[PDB]
Amino acid sequence: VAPTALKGSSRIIGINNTFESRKIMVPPHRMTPLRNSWTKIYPPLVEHLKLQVRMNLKTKSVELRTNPKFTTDPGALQKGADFIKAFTLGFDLDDSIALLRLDDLYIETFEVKDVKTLTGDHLSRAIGRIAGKDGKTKFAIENATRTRIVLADSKIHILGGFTHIRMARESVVSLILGSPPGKVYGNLRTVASRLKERY
């Protein structure tokens, strides 16, 4: 240390992630990305958070337990558990690391059916509307609200600050209901400006 030195809630919302233990089940589609990226997934859990990690091949789950003799931060277990889940939900690894690094990032999860009961081509129509051509619309929502979104079919997961995901979610909901695209874009311009402003 320099001589001049000074003298269990879960971030994800909508799903129950929870000497203590935490288990996270990995779906089949995330198995391979988990494999090649595990060389960079276990370090931050075991060294920074001081946790004990495994992959259960039999149950295809990530098993996480607190070490009473080594672990020090009581929230490390839940923090580590959420980080795995974000990777499980489909977010890129660097985005997932942000949850370990930052303490004010929340994941909001919801399905299209929750907003409104869509089926058949109409359900496909909404997923098309949220995504946009070549992903432009979701890209616009992501940058304007400073949020990361994963549109896995009819399930949407939004990562970012509290009010940020509130505004990204609102834009997504407005798209689902069928609000005119221009109005959604018009907001997406000004939501960005208002958020960054001091007053």
Binding site: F162, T163, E170, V173, R194, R198
Partner: protein, 873 residues
């Protein structure tokens, strides 16, 4: 005795009170420590600039002063203090009631002599400690051993010996062992001074009958005897510049120099200091230079220098006489009159009973100067009538100064005791002027005044005549004759139109100076002693003989206020510059502040010495008062200029024994809303409404013309990633279920929760409160984020909240402005679903209220119609 408006600042005009100063050397330079009553001042020997003053006034007068390098030791009563840079660092308290008399410091030992012939020795706790603190021992000289102690001295090259000098004889005390090493032979004459010589083992002793003895301690024998018949020695000092000279000061005010080598007198300086005040109280040669610093009780400090000899060879015999080099000084007796020379706290005029008038600088003592009295040659060419022996003008009883014409001609008038004319002075040149104003009625001058334009001078005679002169040429212009008794005051308003006078007969005359007519006359019950005229407000106060201050308005010629309470004559008084207070002093040893709007005493002081004069600075920041004792001027800071002062009347009975809050602080806070029916805007900036309506457009202007380049590799979450506070709506944390569009429970935003709680409780007062607090950016964000999807619960609740707000009639512009934003962001949703009952009823309830706030338009249109017509036709 403690004022609530005023506080002491320092004393102006004192350089020395007569106690022997102490010289101290830092490196090559030297400094002089002089006593001023209860505090000391440190001057630089090179320039005689003030450097430091004692931080706090000592409880009792200082008796002895000794300085060694940074530290200065000041003795008062039975306590010896140690000061560094004018701040006390430690206090030595002796254990006997006897008062300290003399003080000596050598090495780690500090020696204090009390009046009871008891010597106290202190020692350093540590060899490296800066100053002695610990109590070593006590040595007492008995009458058999010797007489009263004259002074303590320590010769060089003596290990732990203190040379105690008594009137009878000299003694040598070994402080370490506390034993009397040696006793001198009894001397016939009473010794009065002791000075170690630069030579070894020899101390110069001065007797009361003009004998200087070069006593040799090692041999215990006399070496030399200088004789000064009919004189008393007061100081001795040796020149260390390689010339064997001795300066012998005397109480008569003379300083003699002797050349020890040649056994001859070099010169005598006569009357350098007044004999009445103790003559040369101290004279010290600066170590290794020809400059000698001399002081006395007449409030002056001088320096004399020996120039090099004018003969190339035999420079010793041909000694140039000492030459005046520099000095600082003040009045020898208390000032009689004072006045502030300039609008700032810049310069201050003072005239004293020593017949000298001084201009004192509040901001640097070096700037203080004496106004010379050398006269101009008469314009006529006739010889001036005056005694050949030069004598200072008599004491100045009254003074008036103006600055409208400083530098063009004379600008000060002064009246003298028992003198039938008033003299003029010029501040810029700092010398007496060329005009003398005569009363022309064989009467002494009692009052002097000046017009603001600086063209006229008014002289009030003791026989009741007012003569008006012109300052530029000193020619008489008009003479007014109303009073039959002495005129004690004259004043002229700022406009040079109405003139007012007062006299001992008790009448106050009102004149029109332009037309030279008597506007009116007012008779008061008692004789009038003094006058102060306030030009800004046209009010003048008169100090009546019956112990009252009567305030009169010159415009209407009626008594407006009368102030009672003084138990004796009112020496002096003055108006505050803002015209709101009068401060008056009286012979009963008090100063009272009078609040004119209420006409009562708000503050009172009990001064030990009567305040003969009181004067405010034109700024109002400083109050200056002079006292019957003390050669200086007491300066007070006005605490009212940094905080408000309660105007509650002071308790008279408690004041004697010592010898609505909005109204009390002269402030008022406007109500939030006079009546529930009266429309009232928000308590905040009026740009808030304009900013809210045109937020987007103003921001577009704000954006830079050219886009800023940014690094391609940047953190996405940089804004969130701030180590730790920003209070923006961006920085909100959730407070602790099925998915809901507005907000999931436990994840909802604080604004929505207050709205939903408002919907259930049927009162949105909490929500309206937080809406007003919100910054304009936050307000736009929340209104837009409202749910716009059926059943339109949040929109309907919002309208009711704003409908409730208007009923209060408070903040109605902001509640109005919010609805301009609601339609801008959600107009289409309202339009498409206008037939919906919840929206239609919520809107309809709103319209009924909003229709009631149409009276404002009628008033605004009416006032414009008439205000344009009235101001135009």
């Amino acid at each position: 005795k403690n004022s609530k408006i005023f506080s002491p600042f320092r004393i102006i005009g004192n350089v020395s009170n007569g106690v022997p100063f102490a010289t101290g050397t830092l490196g090559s330079t030297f400094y002089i420590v002089t006593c001023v009553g209860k505090t000391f001042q440190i001057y630089d020997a090179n320039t005689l600039h003030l450097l430091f003053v004692s931080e706090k006034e000592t409880p009792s007068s200082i008796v002895a002063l000794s300085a060694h390098f940074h530290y200065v030791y000041a003795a008062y009563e039975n306590k010896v203090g140690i000061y560094k840079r004018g701040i006390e660092e430690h206090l030595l308290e002796l254990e006997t009631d006897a008062n300290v008399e003399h003080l000596c410091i050598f090495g780690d030992y500090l020696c204090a002599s009390t009046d009871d012939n008891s010597i106290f020795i202190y020692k350093k706790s540590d060899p490296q400690d800066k100053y002695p603190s610990e109590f070593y021992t006590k040595l007492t000289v008995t009458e058999i051993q010797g007489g009263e102690i004259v002074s303590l001295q320590h010769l060089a090259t003596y290990l732990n010996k203190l040379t105690v000098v008594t009137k009878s004889n000299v003694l040598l005390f070994n402080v370490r062992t506390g034993k009397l090493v040696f006793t001198s032979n009894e001397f016939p004459d009473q010794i009065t001074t002791a000075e170690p010589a630069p030579v070894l083992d020899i101390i110069a002793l001065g007797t009361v009958t003009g004998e200087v003895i070069m006593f040799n301690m090692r041999k215990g024998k006399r070496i030399r005897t200088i004789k000064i018949p009919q004189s008393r020695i007061s100081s001795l000092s040796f020149r260390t510049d390689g010339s064997s000279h001795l300066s012998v000061g005397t109480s008569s005010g003379d300083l003699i120099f002797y050349d020890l080598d040649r056994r001859s007198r070099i010169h005598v300086l006569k009357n350098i200091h007044r004999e009445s005040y103790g003559g040369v109280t101290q004279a010290t040669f600066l170590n290794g230079q020809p400059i000698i610093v001399t002081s006395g009780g007449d409030n002056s400090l001088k320096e004399y220098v020996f120039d090099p000899s004018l003969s190339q060879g035999s420079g010793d015999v041909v000694v140039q006489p000492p030459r005046y080099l520099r000095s600082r000084g003040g009045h020898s007796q208390p000032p009689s009159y004072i006045a502030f020379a300039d609008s700032q706290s810049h310069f201050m005029l003072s005239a004293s009973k020593d017949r000298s008038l001084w201009s004192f600088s509040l901001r640097k003592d070096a700037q203080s100067q004496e106004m010379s009295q050398r006269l101009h040659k008469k314009q006529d060419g006739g010889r001036v009538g005056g005694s050949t022996i030069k004598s200072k003008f008599p004491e100045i009883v009254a003074l008036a100064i103006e600055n409208a014409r400083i530098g063009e001609w004379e600008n000060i008038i002064t009246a003298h005791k028992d003198e039938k004319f008033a003299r003029t002075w010029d501040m810029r040149n700092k010398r007496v002027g060329r005009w003398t104003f005569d009363t022309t009625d064989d009467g002494f001058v009692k009052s002097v005044a000046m017009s603001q334009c600086g063209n006229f001078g008014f002289i009030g005679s003791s026989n009741g005549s007012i003569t008006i002169y012109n300052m530029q040429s000193g020619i008489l212009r008009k003479k007014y004759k109303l009073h039959k008794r002495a005129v004690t005051g004259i004043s002229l308003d700022g406009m040079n139109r109405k003139m007012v006078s007062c006299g001992l007969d008790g009448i106050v005359g009102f004149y029109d100076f332009n037309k030279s007519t008597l506007l009116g006359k007012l008779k008061l019950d008692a004789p009038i002693t003094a006058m102060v005229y306030h030009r800004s407000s046209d009010l003048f106060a008169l100090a009546l003989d019956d112990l009252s201050i009567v305030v009169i308005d010159a415009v209407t010629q009626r008594v407006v206020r009368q102030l009672w309470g003084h138990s004796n004559r009112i020496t002096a008084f003055d108006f505050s510059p803002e015209g709101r207070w009068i401060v008056s002093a009286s012979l009963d040893s008090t100063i009272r502040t009078w609040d004119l709007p209420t006409g009562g005493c708000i503050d009172g002081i009990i001064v030990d010495n009567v305040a003969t004069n009181v004067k405010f600075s034109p700024n109002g920041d400083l109050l200056a008062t002079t006292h019957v004792t003390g050669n200086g001027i007491c300066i007070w800071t006005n605490r009212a200029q940094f905080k408000t002062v309660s105007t509650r009347t002071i308790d008279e009975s408690e004041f004697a024994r010592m010898a609505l809050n909005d109204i009390d602080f002269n402030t008022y806070t406007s109500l939030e809303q006079i009546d529930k029916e009266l429309l009232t805007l928000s308590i905040g900036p009026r740009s808030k409404m304009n900013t809210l309506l045109h937020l987007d457009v103003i921001r577009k202007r704000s954006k830079p013309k050219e886009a800023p380049k940014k690094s391609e590799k940047l953190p996405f979450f940089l804004q969130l990633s701030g180590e730790k506070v920003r209070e923006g709506i961006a920085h909100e944390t959730p407070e602790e279920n099925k998915f809901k569009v507005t907000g999931r429970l436990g994840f909802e935003s604080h604004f929505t929760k207050q709205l939903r709680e408002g919907s259930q409780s049927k009162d949105y007062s909490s929500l309206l409160a937080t809406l007003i607090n919100f910054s304009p950016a936050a307000v736009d964000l929340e209104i837009r984020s409202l749910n716009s999807f059926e059943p339109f619960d949040e929109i309907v609740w919002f309208i009711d909240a704003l409908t409730q707000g208007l009923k209060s009639n408070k903040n109605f512009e902001l509640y109005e402005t919010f609805m301009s934003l609601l339609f801008k962001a959600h107009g289409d949703v309202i339009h498409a679903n206008n037939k919906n009952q919840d929206i239609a009823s919520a809107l309809q309830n709103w319209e009924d209220v909003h229709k009631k706030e149409d009276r404002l338009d009628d008033l605004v249109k009416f006032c414009m119609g008439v205000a344009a017509f009235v101001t135009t036709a």
